[PDB]
Predict the 3D structure of the following.
Amino acid sequence: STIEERVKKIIGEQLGVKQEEVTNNASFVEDLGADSLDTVELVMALEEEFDTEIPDEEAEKITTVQAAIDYIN
Amino acid sequence: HMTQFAFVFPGQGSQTVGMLADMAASYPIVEETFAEASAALGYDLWALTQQGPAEELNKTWQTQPALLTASVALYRVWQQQGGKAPAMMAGHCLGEYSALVCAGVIDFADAVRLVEMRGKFMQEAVPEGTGAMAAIIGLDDASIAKACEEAAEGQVVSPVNFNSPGQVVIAGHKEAVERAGAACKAAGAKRALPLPVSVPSHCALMKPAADKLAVELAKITFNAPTVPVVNNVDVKCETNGDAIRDALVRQLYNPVQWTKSVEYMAAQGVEHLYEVGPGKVLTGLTKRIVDTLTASALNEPSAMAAALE
Ligand SMILES: *CC(=O)NCCNC(=O)CCNC(=O)[C@H](O)C(C)(C)COP(*)(=O)O
């Protein structure tokens, strides 16, 4: 399990979605069906697994699977 | 002619200071549309939307013409760049007025004046600081109705917006809304979220406001719609002027059936909802209502370009 695989699993867990649907280019709202409450929870859950603290100025830029992968690096 | 789409229009709560700033910078028709609204209202509506403060943008008799004008400006960008008309339209609360303008039912300047008055009647019926609306997330409809009945305490509070499975908005007196939200959370609700609206729309407190709105709507010409519009109160596509007027009157103090409205569009063969207004509220609801629907917003220039291609 690498960083990208762990980011993908969490997104699938939080959004209730199959792993094959969590593609690198999917956006949370328009593709995976998230609303704005689900995205705030998804960011929190990313801070939990990777022990980072995402400042909410740049949490608001994390709108796609790849944006989250790239932030965690 | 491949994918059938509808246009949906958001209501109060979706406004923000600076909304549509990128679209206006790309498309001069945005600010030309606001200049028409501004002339009807007597003040510069574009400046209010761009400079605020949010305290002014959030006062309902200014909120409502700001949102209506934003939605009509986005529809005019779409059409100006050659976009074709949607298969049908549905407006969420105040958005029903925006849909009726875009369908050709009500003249734009008439509508601008109309929703300013609607906000004034609503504020008159429930003064500033005395009402509230709250979104109860993840709780069954039997429990919310029970929480509301027990929290009334001689005041008004009831479910008014069926927004999706797992989202019902309640509204009434401020203190009653707080007691109902606390009891909802105590009964297993995930959140009880207060909303940025200055009046409690669609509850019984608005009934006297609806009586005055009926008289104002009688003074306005209604035309037959050129695109079907699904109304909030009955989930019906009315065409006659008297039917449309009556549904707007009743909308002010009866529940908004947004879940059933989106189900109906899907049943008619709509495959994609475009949200024609600021924010992404209606987009975030769509898949929780019908899992096979897709949705996106048309309030940024890049999204507009991609949808037109
Ligand atoms: C039409 C109307 O009555 N408007 C005033 C009441 N507001 C609503 O009915 C919508 C309430 N729901 C929301 O605003 C969003 O769904 C959430 C819960 C705030 C999440 O927002 P996010 O997806 O931007």
